[PDB]
Amino acid sequence: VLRDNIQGITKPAIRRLARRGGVKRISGLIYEETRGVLKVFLENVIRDAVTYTEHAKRKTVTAMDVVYALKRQGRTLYGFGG
Amino acid sequence: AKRHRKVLRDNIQGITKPAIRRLARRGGVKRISGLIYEETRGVLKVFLENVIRDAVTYTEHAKRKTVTAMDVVYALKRQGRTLYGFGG
Amino acid sequence: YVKWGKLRDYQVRGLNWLISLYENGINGILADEMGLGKTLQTISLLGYMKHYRNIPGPHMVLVPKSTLHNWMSEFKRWVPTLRSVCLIGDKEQRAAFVRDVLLPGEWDVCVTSYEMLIKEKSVFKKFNWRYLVIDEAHRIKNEKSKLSEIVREFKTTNRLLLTGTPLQNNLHELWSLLNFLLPDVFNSADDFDSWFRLHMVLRPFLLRRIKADVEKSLPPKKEVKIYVGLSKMQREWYTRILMKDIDILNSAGKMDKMRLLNILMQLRKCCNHPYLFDGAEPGPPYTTDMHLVTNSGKMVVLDKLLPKLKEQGSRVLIFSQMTRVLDILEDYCMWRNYEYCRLDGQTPHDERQDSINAYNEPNSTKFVFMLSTRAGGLGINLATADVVILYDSDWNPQVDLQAMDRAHRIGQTKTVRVFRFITDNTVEERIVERAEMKLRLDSIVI
Amino acid sequence: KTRKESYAIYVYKVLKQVHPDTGISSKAMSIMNSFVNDVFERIAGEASRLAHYNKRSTITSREIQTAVRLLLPGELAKHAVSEGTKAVTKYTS
Amino acid sequence: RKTRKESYAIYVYKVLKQVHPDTGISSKAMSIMNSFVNDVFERIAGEASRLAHYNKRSTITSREIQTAVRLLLPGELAKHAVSEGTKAVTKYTSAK
Amino acid sequence: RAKAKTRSSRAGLQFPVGRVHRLLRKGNYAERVGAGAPVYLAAVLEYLTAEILELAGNAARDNKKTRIIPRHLQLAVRNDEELNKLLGRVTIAQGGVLPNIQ
Amino acid sequence: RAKAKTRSSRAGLQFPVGRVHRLLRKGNYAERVGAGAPVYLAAVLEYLTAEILELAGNAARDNKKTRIIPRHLQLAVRNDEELNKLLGRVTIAQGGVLPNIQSVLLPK
Amino acid sequence: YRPGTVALREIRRYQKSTELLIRKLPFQRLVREIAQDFKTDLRFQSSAVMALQEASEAYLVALFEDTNLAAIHAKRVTIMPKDIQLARRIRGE
Amino acid sequence: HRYRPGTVALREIRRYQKSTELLIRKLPFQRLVREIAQDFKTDLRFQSSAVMALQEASEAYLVALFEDTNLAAIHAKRVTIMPKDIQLARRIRGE
DNA sequence: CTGGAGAATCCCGGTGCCGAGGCCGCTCAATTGGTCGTAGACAGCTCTAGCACCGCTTAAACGCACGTACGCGCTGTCCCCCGCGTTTTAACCGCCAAGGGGATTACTCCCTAGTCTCCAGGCACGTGTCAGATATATAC
DNA sequence: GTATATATCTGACACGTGCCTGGAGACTAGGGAGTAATCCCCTTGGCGGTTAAAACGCGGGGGACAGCGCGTACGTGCGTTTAAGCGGTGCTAGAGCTGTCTACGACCAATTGAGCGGCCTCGGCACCGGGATTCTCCAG
Ligand SMILES: Nc1ncnc2c1ncn2[C@@H]1O[C@H](COP(=O)(O)OP(=O)(O)O)[C@@H](O)[C@H]1O
Ligand SMILES: [Mg+2]
């Protein structure tokens, strides 16, 4: 059973995402706030991706299961066999 | 002159300042700036243009000259503005 | 009992018919030709009851808003003995009249406009009424009109309608008036219709008497028609209306396009004047004093006023069916500097009577009257004048006959002249033809 | 000369089980008919897609169960699935 | 044994060479173009389906596709596209 | 033949199983529809109907009314955290705004 | 039997008319589907394809590289107002953000 | 009464009511002008203009909520044209 | 030598706004995804491209949220992002 | 203000490489032809409701003036990021093994659509009384 | 001590009526679906190796933020004028229905060529290590 890997999303990696988004200066409490925001987004996408796999009676999550889960939530992604 | 006592405003002006203030009061706005009446009219007009253009596309497709309540409800639904009460 | 003047023989004869109906237990409708003095005959009826039968119970008179000051005057002059009270006013004034006058029971007749009734139907419902007399009863020709219903509710011993024009459009309407009066004698529209026989059903409940037989002294009327041709601005506009390419947009935008869902109306607004249509008038300044007369064929022909002002004082009327037309005529008259008067449905009540009187004075400076057929073409009396010009024609022919009779009434001693501006080759020609077809069914029955 | 189907009688039969005393207005009943139509079109759209992704010709109750699980929020989904499975067991008996 | 997988790639290439003769396209940019064509096909076909149900017709036709295109595409893209499709049907019906 | 019983009566439901089956068959969802699909769907629509009317009837009662009106329905949907997520993009006509002043 | 001519050749198109017809028939869009419908739709799909690849090719030549790659496609869609309105809810893989800083953040 | 005392009293009234706040004739005349530019000479159902007015007033009330949270974020109580523009930008419209 | 506070922040914005690489490290994100999956079902296996599809979608979402968050701080007349700016952006979006 | 120093990407020319275009073979969906039957264009009719004038009343909006809540420019304040360097840990790369489970094809036989026939739920219809929407007199 | 609370009508809901057309019976049809079994793609941790990335600490100056004062603008209520709202009346545009007739598409069988995967290779351009300005900063 995996322990808490949400601390594996490092402070340097969150800062590079803020830089691609055009952010010049960042407060210290953004990191704790961003990790929860990411976790809520992943929980919503993975839950549906697994509902699809179960309907198909398969143990492996496929790239299509993820693409269909994102397509429902209004987040079309090109590139993964869509 | 008798021929001209009355004078007509543009139809956007029919949305009066008293009419906008009540809408902002339902939205919980306490104080409001002066330039918002011009800004709000511009915003409503862009909303009405996008809904009406589609409601007329549906009417033309059906070969009818009258816009119906269903033509408006389908146009709002297609834009994510679902409306209950007018059928469908 | 009558005091100011004696009655004409026909008028005495009328009260006899009227009083028989009370004894009979029937109600009915009196229908002499318009302007033959029906009002007085009714005032006498309410006084018969006070003097001879001793019934002073409250009665009701419903009259058009214009005739409210005439109705009152009449009662006072001819039969001062009956007491009367009349309702008109804003919300506040109306309440005070209810509280300080109507409810104290110090009166025997209420006279009020058809409008103030719908506004305050309750206080009216409380009382119990003896006679309900409704002048100008074409306002309740539709069986389902709001007023027609409210009127039916109030309690009543006897009822009389007085209408100059018994027939307006079709038989269903006649059934409607017969029902309010004799609901028992006319249970359904269907029954009245189909069974249809002229005069036989009408004789017991209807009394009609034309001016020619009763008042021989009256000068007979003249019918004339002035066909006209369209001006040039008109010919262009009339065409572009039909083509639906008027374009024309005040706020630049490449002239946009006008909306013309209903076409017959647009063409008629222009056959009157192209100035009515926006943007046709030339230029921002406006104020050109002579362009008006020449830009409309009917106004070119209106130069006839100048001969008539000099040709003795034969005064004229110029009725209309649209307010804007009347606006033009007022600014034009101001340019010629003639003497004029105008009523409209927009005007206040107090002013209406004043302007009927200054004009009716025995030796007044006024020469022309401009009056809308709806607001002022029913019930007022304007006998001083001798010529009638009708700027426009109406779909129902009885709307027209009446406006012509404002002048021709008891007291007229000069021929009443009738003149109608019509355009010879347009849809205006159709409208006039259509009104005529409806009259044929009526035919001024004796 | 033309009939118009609606859910109105079914909405009223359920109303009287939930609240025997109450009634409902015509405006409110028109909103209730619109709710049933909207929800029906959502569930049948996901079912249809599910079948296609998995290459199947039939919509079954197993596809409607999964569509309900994809569409409803968690507390409604667990109850809606319980009500659907109770009905299908009783119907099959 | 190993089953075939259909794609738009050979048509996407043939259209590129008509537009820019000397240029190429990497395998990842091909996966994205194949995704784009399928997204736009599904959008147009879903609107064309509904419009027929609203008007109670059982057939999809070029008229329902023309209305679907005017509802979905932005203003200028819609104009040129409509011309391209009506041109193609005019040429096809001359040669069927 | 035997005397008819509605399929809703067999399932123990108030909503119409037969109409729902026809709607699905004629809506172009799939080329085939199963026999349990209309029963499962009618159960879910009746459950969701009952959830709204229970909250709407409580709102009518607190407001001292016997009759549910469009305002009572808005109050019910917007004060429930799951119904307001199910219905986050719909406008209810003559439905007011929940009262809130910052 | 006469020699076959594929329907795309008859309409003067590069995209496939025959495949589009199958996809529509088997996709549950309607009970029936007309013969002019796949021709109209194939013409629109080829126009929209040429519209993108034209601007992608120009972005590749601006970068001095001979092959279109996934970033070139992003720079094209985002820099055109109508393609950005058509594809406003789409993420493209290996697609960068257009270069951009709010002027408030730049040095004096 | 003091500045803002009546403003809170109106906020409470209007939030309780469920009526339409714009006049019906002045709004119908605007719908018909916008339309003439798309197609000419259309006619309209009486219920179709009411669906447009309900949808319009619902849209503006919801935009005024987002405008007031963007005003309070900048530490003001007065809404201004810039707050409308930030709300419309974050919503992506 | 020393550059001044915020000068290297601008080079970092330009450098990351040119490249299309993934910024979060791959192996750490793969452990995060799998940990989340155990709440829904045990012993799921995973395609390698299914994790890359999740990472591409996740970094695209965070970059776009940081843009809306920055507008809000400039609106409040500041240059530093604060937790209340993420909360305002999500609330106005409808999340 | 601004010369100077010195870290930043920036061209330039060589070096190797597994990506992309070419072709092969041959697979299996498009083609044509013929046929069937029923979607939908046409015309006709009827009659609902939409469009244009007026009239009426009085809520509503107009503009005026009054005065003070609060918009927003400077200043001082002193905390918390930035950037540097350092040390430190865990990412990447490559290599090689076992065996879960995607995938194929094959077989068999339960499922649903089709048809026709049938009769009861649901449609619109026309009343009626009440829930509510204020009128009507109280009441303290 | 006065505003509900007594008090009073009234279109809207709710009842039942009559009526008629989708739901339900009960068989045959022939495909989809399920389940067996096979094969061998791709997944899961093994180790070691060793770069690069994350981590730590802490000098120092940027921006966040509170407070003050200043001043014009938004809200208030007055009287005023305006036209929304409601009835009345005319009329006929064009939604709607039914009816009829015939172009169209789906279907079958049969046919043969575009398009699939497999196996291929010389050339696009990643990478390394040479010098070029030219970003920025600071002590004269
Ligand atoms: N007997 C009479 N003697 C003198 N004048 C009369 C007599 N009867 C009526 N009049 C006048 O003639 C006119 C008749 O018009 P009116 O009373 O309005 O009748 P109607 O209601 O039929 O139009 C009135 O102005 C009245 O003054
Ligand atoms: Mg009179």
Residue numbers in the entry:
A (entry chain F): 21 to 102
B (entry chain B): 15 to 102
C (entry chain W): 174 to 369, 383 to 632
D (entry chain H): 28 to 120
E (entry chain D): 27 to 122
F (entry chain G): 11 to 112
G (entry chain C): 11 to 118
H (entry chain A): 41 to 133
Quote from the publication.
Here, to address this issue, we develop graphene-oxide-coated EM grids functionalized with either single-stranded DNA (ssDNA) or thiol-poly(acrylic acid-co-styrene) (TAASTY) co-polymer. These grids protect complexes between the chromatin remodeler SNF2h and nucleosomes from the AWI and facilitate collection of high-quality micrographs of intact SNF2h-nucleosome complexes in the absence of crosslinking. We chose to use SNF2h as a test case because SNF2h adopts both monomeric and dimeric states on a nucleosome, with the dimeric state being more active. We generated complexes by mixing 500 nM SNF2h and 100 nM nucleosomes with a 60-base pair DNA overhang on one end in the presence of 60 mM KCl and 2 mM ADP-BeFx and directly applied 3 µL to ssDNA GO and/or TAASTY GO grids.
In one of the six components, we see rocking of SNF2h on the nucleosome, where both lobes of the SNF2h ATPase shift upwards away from SHL6 and towards the histone octamer core. In agreement with this hypothesis, closer inspection of the nucleotide state for each endpoint structure from this variability component shows that SNF2h bound to SHL6 has clear density for ADP-BeFx, whereas SNF2h dissociated from SHL6 does not, and only ADP is clearly visible.
